[PDB]
Amino acid sequence: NVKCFNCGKEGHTARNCRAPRKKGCWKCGKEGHQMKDCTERQ
Ligand SMILES: [Zn+2]
Ligand SMILES: [Zn+2]
């Protein structure tokens, strides 16, 4: 279902989530790096 980019629990988005944004990958789902770090773009 819909899930969050911040914390990644379903039934809400990062725009709803007031859990501040996380250290893991905001996108690719791994956590051995952050959203900046991730070579998903590159
Ligand atoms: Zn969330
Ligand atoms: Zn990543």
Question: Could you please describe the fold and organization of this structure?
Answer:
The protein has a single domain, classed as Zinc finger, CCHC-type (HIV-1 Nucleocapsid Protein), CATH 4.10.60.10. It is 0% helix and 0% strand. It has no helix or strand. Bound molecules: zinc ion (2 copies). One zinc ion binds next to loops. The PDB classes it as viral protein. Keywords: HIV-1, protein, Viral protein. The assembly is monomeric. The entry is titled "solution structure of NCP7 from HIV-1".
CATH architecture: Irregular
What does the overall shape look like? elongated
- Distinct ligand kinds: zinc ion
Number of strands: 0
Number of domains: 1
Question: What is the fourth-level CATH superfamily?
Answer: Zinc finger, CCHC-type
Oligomer kind: monomer
CATH topology: HIV-1 Nucleocapsid Protein
Tell me the fraction of residues in β-strands, as a range.
under 5%
- From the alpha carbons, calculate the radius of gyration and give it in angstroms: 10 Å
Query: Which CATH top level class fits?
Result: Few Secondary Structures
End-to-end Cα distance, whole Å, is 28 Å
Give the number of helices: 0
Most strands sheet: none
Structural class: little secondary structure
Helix content: under 10%
